[PDB]
């Protein structure tokens, strides 16, 4: 899971559900 939990986690981060809205 290394790498791939640890990519999708920042990838959401910045948007946070929305289109780039809230970076969670």
């Known amino acids: 899971k290394?790498?791939?939990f640890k990519r999708?986690?920042?990838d959401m981060m910045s948007?946070?559900?929305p289109p780039?809205?809230?970076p969670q």
């Open 2 to 4: 290394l790498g791939f």
């Open 8 to 10: 999708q986690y920042k």
């Open 15 to 17: 948007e946070g559900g």
């Open 20 to 22: 780039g809205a809230e």
